[PDB]
Symmetry: C5
Subunit: 312 residues, 5 copies
């Protein structure tokens, strides 16, 4: 079969709508998420029109093989979606209403700069390619767009699911392409990380500062403190970066871990300095420890104040 | 083909039933589990009635392609289930009895607040969408609901598998939808975790208390004890939280590990205090150790008493 | 097509047989294994009989779509098997011999109580559901049961592949079901674990005992020994249990690791005691070390004797 | 159907083109990447010519099963691509223009010698096998080659996507084969590794040098420093090499880690030497530390200068 | 359709040949590898002969459904291969030449005794089952066997790809089976492991020997050295064995790691002995250190000489 003829020289618009049923498997490392939703299309094929009075039927349903149906494709997807046609109902005037349920693995990049205080805008791009008989354009039926109430992305807050009404039509390989942009905005729930990374870092800084209260003569103890806290800092750094894709930039968590490492390494340099001035000039070492015991936790407290105040 | 005509203006009810055959792959992190069971439907299509005398057959079986069959779908599923039709038998009055065997990956959220002493209610949602010719409603055939005796969840105890008789009918994209809620209740077997996390934590607290009995002059020894116990606590915490999804709340295990970390870090602060009072005021330090050796294991024992008494 | 008519009122028996061709991917954690074997069925459909003299052919082969074939299904399998029909040959009397080659992921629970000295009985459950025209029963053709010589389960010794002749017939959803039990018995090869887990534990106990021979005055050294051996014990314990499913009970390896941890922690308590009696009553501490140096390795040797003697 | 007849004795050329739509899952360890793009073919089958006036259509489109289509296969692919035919348009002269959208897992080796400062040229090899009736040759339609602007490799910069016009024709199993070479050039974004590995190594070298400023009499402290830095170096080496395939050569990161290990182990040998000359010849040890404190960081700075200057 | 009739009473031989196109994903742990190659068959079905003069065609091509084709199966494969028929050309005398392109996951056991200096012989087993009308036997057409030059196993050197000409015929379930053995011999590239495991082990032995040059009075330092090197050895052992399947035997790497562990633990026993003889009989301890400093690195050098000389 072939596309319906134009009543003049006008483009055929397909009213689209997506209703999210299930939303799962948001992969930060793969920058993909799995979706299972309704796809609804609606166009006008006057060849299928009929008299509502002579025909005692009010709708009349067809099978996908019976009538022409537009080839609608997703762009930012890994494999072609798995779709099951739910219903096809033509109107007495020829208005075809098509409804399927599909599942797909969507590939949408994420911006981890404000991670884990980041919000994302996942994109689902519909697209249709014009035929030689007629140009096809996509539209948005807001009545057919939405998401179920029990849709959940564990670890995220789902903000909204909308669509950009004005489609992007463009030339591609000598044919017209019409693209729609469905947008799922979310905001990450950072609490999980506060006890996953932020607490080990803060407690490691505190543990490193405890060394300033040990006697300056007991070198091995303070050495254990400093060294173990520095290595612990490095381990937390790598471990934390192992959850993200190979992004080139640095996240907010990256900055917090970096400042913590600065404090711990500062405690190391301090321990080395004091140990260097212990035999000769014991007054200097005593002053260094005495001042550090007040400055370190103070600067650290101010830092946490500015940080959590900023990212919350 | 199209749905059977209403004998007046009455909804077509489809009597459903699920019989769990196999139950496996309950993923705590993905909050999904794989199910393999029987799906049984039963309705009345008077068009299929027949004379039991003229027709020498008492039942008569059809092929799925021959007669109208309702489109029954699962909601909380990742992909459309894989089903093999087992049998289709019509009654002389037109009562179609349909039986298939399906396997599906069900997506059901979990509540880890009482983890690992938690009980869960896995949900399997049936749903059918009404056609324009007639509304379809779902029902539950208690005779067709159940589960095999050899159904096992390697880490769980299976409590029961029932279904909510009253379906949830609602409007979706201008059509009526009927949803049924099958519930599989389970309770986790916590023993695995007692030796996976709880024992390492308790033994780390005890090991941390062993430092109080070492001579106050041998500083490096007590330093090794305290530091290693604190780092061990941090590692056990992270490792333990790595088994769950990025939930925002805290589990019971989270509380136990948190209190253990409180005891260990308290032992650290104690070591720092005593080391600070060792040269000047040795009597004070001696009092500190003497009291700690009795308070720490006592408060810890009381805590374990309240905790294990509460969560069991 | 429909099932062959009963020559009176007798059940139709299908002679079954499985020939293991390939056996791989035995997953201890998933309690599943992958199989690839021959499935052979044989029944009597007198409608297919023919004259061996008038018909110059001795066998005559059909296509699956041509004749009725019983719907045979596996029970303890995750998805429907992937089968390729190999041959279908009818006899002059109507004896259909059907042969396919299938691969399936079988789900069979394991008993890790004697792990890693455990033996298992993997189960493959065949089943057939009776039709309304005739009851179908399963049988076992010992001539068609077996396994290839080059079948290997890396890390296991394959003992036998047999079948329980008497099938389990029972009522299910108002129809008769016939179940057969094929059993693949295997015994694990424990050597891999002796150098994977048992050696690290034994060597850790020895290393812990080495501290008793260090001078009682060098406290930090003995502290390092004891602490590192205890942490090593915990790490080996958790690491070892990470290979099994979340079973509630304890394995033999669990017992060995537990006794090792008891010896190491006992060495810790000993170090604390001696360090506590070093200044006052040095004779007591000296006696403690002197006795431990002989008692610890002796009790440990006896333990290994009873253990390896028992589980070997 | 069979290939179109040659208008004389000429090979049939198929004008090919790939338009990258999606590019993802570039696996360094598997040396594979997943691609999703348009494949466009174009040939001349005069048997399909038609009158544009008698036939009221100006192009008129067919189904894949209707007309002869050349068997085009990818070479460096793991499984046969999953393709959905988008359009087939014939011209009045018989010019078939074919368009599909495919996804495939391409297998292209990588050169990690300059890793992570490496650039790669991923290859996609098309091929067609000539039939006995006519030889088939592949060509490149530059109008049909390109890639979408929103194509992204989460860890790479995409340089260009071109194709080698002149195909490689050769004999294979007594038939002619024509191969085309599409090339996607990329350059890795190394920043991720600077904070993933390079910083831990640099900070570990610095931390190892901090030991030279500790008193020569406090042996245990310097021991802790040296040992922990050496073990940290080894762990970072192994961990770093765990990201690449089992390549036989050494990467640039391998060289950086190797020099760092040389500096750290050199600090170990230095500590051993000084500790050996501390009691006898204290002036010598003092000279050793005094010189090392200036030589080590200087040679390290020069090394970093030459290295980062070279690889950037 | 049915097999071609025998011109007398002779077996039908099918000339087979495999041409490796792609070879990848050699999994040492799973003992499987993925292959993608050409499969070429050639037999004689006299029913298809034709006159080359009356028929104006020189070859004439058929569809798989048109003519009888032998059921060729792989044995040591996990799932049935995915094959796409490339060409079918019959000769005027009836010689059918069949060509497909397949991909399959081959399962072949490996011998890790000489690992990582091991060479393997991967097996691909063809097999055909004789029908009741005629016995079928497999043969090898050397013209159709080979492999592309750009075939690579990222961690191996590919030696050759040949086939055993004489097939293995045997009885199976009352029918004749013919099996062919294609052999791909390879030799592992061990360099990756020299810097992955061998270097950490050697440097850890050296690090353990460094303790002999430290003063006998600084007990804690030597304790740190010995303990850390022993634990490092154990970790390298387990980590190394984690790359192989649960084999019961020991590899060459296993032996090297074992000897290294013997040297390190010997250094531990030495430190304990000297520490035991430090106060009383200091001359004995001094002699122990003096001799060890020369014997240990010498015995280690001799060992490395014999080892690397043997396995290379
Ligand atoms: C106190 C006065 C007398 C001298 C202080 C000099 C230091 C403050 C300088 C010398 C080395 C510098 C460090 C060089 C490297 C790093 C590593 C970097 O840490 C990380 O690895 C980040 C990890 C991550 O982001 O996940 C943070 C900055 C820091 C500590 C620098 C902070 C500033 C340091 C410690
Ligand atoms: C009032 C001045 C003079 C003394 C202040 C001392 C405090 C800074 C110390 C005493 C008790 C310590 C607390 C003891 C226990 C913990 C629980 C710990 O929580 C966890 O580790 C959670 C782990 C998990 O969630 O798995 C966070 C640090 C904290 C609050 C410690 C932070 C440091 C505290 C508050
Ligand atoms: C305090 C003095 C006066 C008497 C000595 C008492 C000790 C012999 C007790 C105190 C704590 C007890 C320990 C408490 C808990 C356990 C854990 C238990 O299980 C495990 O270690 C886990 C092993 C596994 O499951 O794989 C082994 C015995 C052990 C170490 C106990 C051994 C006996 C211990 C050391
Ligand atoms: C300077 C003179 C007076 C005494 C030299 C004694 C040591 C400093 C020498 C003896 C053995 C040498 C080692 C022999 C082999 C190597 C392996 C080499 O390989 C790597 O670390 C590669 C790391 C990677 O591939 O990622 C690093 C240098 C090192 C340790 C050498 C460093 C210098 C060592 C320790
Ligand atoms: C002479 C007696 C009175 C006191 C000293 C005895 C030790 C020197 C003996 C007792 C146990 C023996 C150990 C038994 C087993 C092994 C394991 C072996 O290495 C391994 O098996 C590690 C596993 C691997 O290589 O994969 C190295 C020698 C060693 C430590 C032996 C070294 C010699 C040991 C320590
Ligand atoms: C995190 C930082 O970067 C700060 C926070 C507190 C600061 C320290 C406070 C007190 C002193 C004592 C002084 O000794 S003196 O008698 O020679 O003047 C030398 C400088 C020193 C060690 C400061 C160095 C910088 C800090 C570590
Ligand atoms: C989990 C907790 O937080 C508890 C567990 C055990 C408790 C300690 C038991 C004994 C003492 C000695 C007493 O005397 S003093 O001369 O140091 O002031 C001061 C209080 C102090 C340090 C308790 C503080 C609170 C704990 C750390
Ligand atoms: C695994 C075990 O449970 C055994 C292994 C070795 C045993 C110890 C050997 C030596 C002594 C010294 C003796 O000292 S006394 O003068 O106070 O009586 C008290 C008893 C004590 C601590 C034994 C207790 C039990 C063991 C810890
Ligand atoms: C990267 C390297 O490998 C260099 C960097 C600094 C160098 C050291 C500087 C000073 C001295 C003191 C001298 O002692 S002496 O009084 O006997 O001459 C002996 C040589 C020694 C240990 C050098 C050895 C080589 C280095 C470790
Ligand atoms: C790898 C090994 O196992 C060997 C390699 C070198 C050997 C050592 C060489 C020298 C001596 C001195 C001698 O002292 S004595 O005055 O009592 O005789 C006692 C024995 C002792 C410690 C040897 C023990 C065994 C070794 C550690
Ligand atoms: Cl799609
Ligand atoms: Cl479904
Ligand atoms: Cl099955
Ligand atoms: Cl392909
Ligand atoms: Cl196959």
């Amino acid at each position: 079969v072939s596309p319906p003829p134009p009543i003049a020289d006008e483009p055929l618009t397909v009213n689209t709508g997506i209703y999210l049923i299930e939303c799962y498997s948001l992969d930060d490392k793969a920058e993909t998420f799995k979706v299972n939703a309704f796809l609804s299309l609606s166009w006008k094929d006057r060849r299928l029109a009929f008299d509502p009075v002579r025909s005692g039927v009010r709708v009349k349903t067809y099978e996908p093989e019976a009538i022409w149906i537009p080839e609608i494709r997703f762009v930012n997807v890994e494999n072609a979606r798995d779709a099951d046609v739910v219903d096809i109902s033509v109107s007495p005037d020829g208005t075809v209403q098509y409804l399927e349920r599909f599942s797909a693995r969507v590939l949408s990049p994420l911006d981890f700069r404000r991670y884990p205080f980041d919000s994302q805008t996942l994109h689902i791009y519909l697209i249709v390619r014009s035929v030689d008989t007629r140009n096809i354009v996509l539209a948005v039926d807001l009545e057919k767009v939405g998401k179920n109430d029990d849709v959940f992305l564990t670890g995220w807050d789902i903000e909204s699911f909308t669509a950009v009404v004005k489609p992007a039509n463009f030339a591609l390989e000598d044919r017209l392409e019409s693209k729609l942009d469905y947008q799922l905005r979310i905001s990450r729930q950072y609490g999980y990380f506060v006890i996953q990374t932020y607490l080990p870092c803060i407690m490691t800084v505190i543990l490193s500062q405890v060394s300033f209260w040990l006697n300056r003569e007991s070198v091995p103890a303070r050495t254990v403190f400093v060294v173990t806290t520095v290595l612990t800092m490095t381990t937390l750094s790598i471990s934390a970066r192992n959850s993200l894709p190979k992004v080139a930039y640095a996240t907010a968590m990256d900055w917090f871990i970096a400042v913590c490492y600065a404090f711990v390494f500062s405690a190391l340099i301090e321990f080395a300095t004091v140990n260097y001035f212990t035999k000769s000039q014991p007054a200097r070492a005593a002053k260094i420890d005495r001042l550090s015991r007040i400055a370190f936790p103070l600067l650290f407290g101010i830092f946490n104040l500015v940080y959590w105040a900023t990212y919350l």
